Amino acid sequence: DQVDVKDCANNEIKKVMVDGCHGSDPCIIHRGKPFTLEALFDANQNTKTAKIEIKASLDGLEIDVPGIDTNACHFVKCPLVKGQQYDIKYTWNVPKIAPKSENVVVTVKLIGDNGVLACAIATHGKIRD
Numbered sequence: 001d002q003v004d005v006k007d008c009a010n011n012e013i014k015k016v017m018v019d020g021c022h023g024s025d026p027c028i029i030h031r032g033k034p035f036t037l038e039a040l041f042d043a044n045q046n047t048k049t050a051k052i053e054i055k056a057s058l059d060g061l062e063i064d065v066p067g068i069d070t071n072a073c074h075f076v077k078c079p080l081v082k083g084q085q086y087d088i089k090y091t092w093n094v095p096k097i098a099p100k101s102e103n104v105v106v107t108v109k110l111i112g113d114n115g116v117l118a119c120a121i122a123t124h125g126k127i128r129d
Contacts, residue, residue: 008119009041027106027122028129031097037106039120040087043080047113050078055107056090063090072110080112101127
């Protein structure tokens with residue numbers, strides 16, 4: 001079920017949803033289900049390069065993107081520009097995780113060289129219901 005995450009790609013994304021979590025409000029998520037967040041988009045800018053600012057924090061899964069790649073390349077089709085379609089992502093193997101997580105926080109943003117290819121932020125996020 002999609003949600004209401006404040007994305008900032010360009011009203012061009014082809015599919016941006018999140019397996020349970022709730023967008024906009026304090027993204028509350030559920031346990032026992034794969035919270036594979038996502039957000040696709042067809043490169044419409046013009047830059048073979050690319051940047052990134054993703055940040056997913058999970059109790060036993062502290063996703064993070066402090067600069068792992070060198071230009072949204074090791075994570076996606078580096079060259080976005082307006083001549084390529086591609087789908088970043090952040091799967092989620094969900095065991096049980098119990099209710100409520102020690103802490104959580106979702107955020108994201110793709111920046112080529114002309115603007116922000118994509119974006120997604122879940123102000124606060126508590127597991128449980």
